[PDB]
Amino acid sequence: MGSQFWVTSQKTEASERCGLQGSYILRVEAEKLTLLTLGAQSQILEPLLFWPYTLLRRYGRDKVMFSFEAGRRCPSGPGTFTFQTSQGNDIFQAVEAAIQQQKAQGK
Amino acid sequence: MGSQFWVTSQKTEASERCGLQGSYILRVEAEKLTLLTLGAQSQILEPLLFWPYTLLRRYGRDKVMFSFEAGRRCPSGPGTFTFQTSQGNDIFQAVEAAIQQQKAQ
Helix, strand or coil: CCEEEEEEEECCHHHHHCCCCCEEEEEECCCEEEEEEECCCCCCEEEEEEEEHHHEEEEEECCCEEEEEECCCCCCCCEEEEEECCCHHHHHHHHHHHHHHHHCCCC | CCEEEEEEECCCHHHHHCCCCCEEEEEECCCEEEEEEECCCCCCEEEEEEEEHHHEEEEEECCCEEEEEECCCCCCCCEEEEEECCCHHHHHHHHHHHHHHHHCC
């Protein structure tokens, strides 16, 4: 389904609105980034939030984190989402290849 | 559900009938291939057609494409589905494993 990274949410209004707190799995997929958590019942990983690439305003990273700005149409509502992690470059790389691959009509 | 590949529909009687045209994601799952299109409003991939492995006559690949024949029992109907892709092999491999694990019980 796509690469997964264990990340920790650092406070922003959007993450606050979505009641995000603590650590999650961010998964880079073909047309979206998904945020996942252990299901309370299922006790396996399940989606908590979707961010279709075509609905993100911008995204970036550094040696300490990964961050992006969801646009109005994203399910979380508009705003910045930032996650602490030392694999910022890796998530950025995968998001970037998904998008180019996707923009190339995908095939 | 499994690994996904971007694919382009190749004109075929069945794909015409199902109305397929353009790019899609072919997802090879534990018991079927699922053809997903990107959501109009949502901008999220969404199931379009599903082909359970036990309902496929055969399938295969080429450096230029991947293809399979659905049996009469598929929701899409019987016929050939071909998708131009340069990953026909990785897909094919994936289906093998999918199917290998299935009857591996």
